[PDB]
Amino acid sequence: GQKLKQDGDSFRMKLNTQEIFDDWARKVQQRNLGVSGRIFTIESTRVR
């Protein structure tokens, strides 16, 4: 029984989830997504 509980605790520890949340939040803050600016943009492209 204690062997099984230790095993399950080990897998659950390997099955944590908050770290990916933290990583995604950090990446979102770093990239600094935004929409404010002009209504629409006109750009230069040399279409093939």
Place this chain on the structure above:
Amino acid sequence: RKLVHDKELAAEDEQVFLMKQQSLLAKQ
């Protein structure tokens, strides 16, 4: 004095209008 139709509706090709408005966006 039979009147003739005046200047027709112009096209003002998309490229020129886009360039003018790109300039206006750049200056604003």
